[PDB]
Amino acid sequence: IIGGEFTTIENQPWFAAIYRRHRGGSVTYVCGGSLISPCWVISATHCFIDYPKKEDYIVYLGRSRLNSNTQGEMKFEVENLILHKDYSADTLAHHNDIALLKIRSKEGRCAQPSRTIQTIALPSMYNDPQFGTSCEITGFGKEQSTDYLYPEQLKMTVVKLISHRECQQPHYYGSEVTTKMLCAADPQWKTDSCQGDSGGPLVCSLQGRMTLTGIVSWGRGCALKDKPGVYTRVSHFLPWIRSHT
């Protein structure tokens, strides 16, 4: 997250921290995700495409820090890793950039809701907020595009939804942006998601409830003029989500 503010997991208790085991035992952060039911985390296919083996991943819930434990956190293995069959990528755009992780602990349990671990509501079909609506993004992603490291503490910020029509302008992303994507950005381009925030939640209040409107998918650089963050438009994938969960 470029700009914005530091936060803790209580402010985004559906946030899932996804890591990968190596290859000699080191564990590195991969991407964010969102808990949509006790056993299911939703994220982006691009986070896993190159290394699709479920055994390689660890998921944490109730975690506020990257490399240190947080009191109340839960650690999970990935029972199933479901990537979208229609996924595709070019230099930039990732199409159908959506993934589901079925989570299970060593002891065979799913998530237990608490003050630090809660599910996030899915939107109703084809129902998004109007353009200019302020939404929140959360993650352990880079604080500056040039940074080598990720922040140790969870961050969040606010970005405003941009219309498909504005985002498809040539100076923005042209044809790269489809109707199954949502653009969002800061009016001054001063705050944004960035590398390492992929798979994480874009949350909007809809019909009075915090709703998973988007999943951080792609973009050119970060907090860059005329280059919004691009998000998988969750309201266009409800049949896929329902079937695979």
Binding site: A89, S145, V216, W218, G219, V230
Partner: peptide
């Protein structure tokens, strides 16, 4: 570069 962007996390070529 592209490897510093959203979209290329956990990629072999990066």
């Amino acid at each position: 570069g592209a490897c510093s962007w959203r979209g290329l996390e956990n990629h072999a070529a990066c």
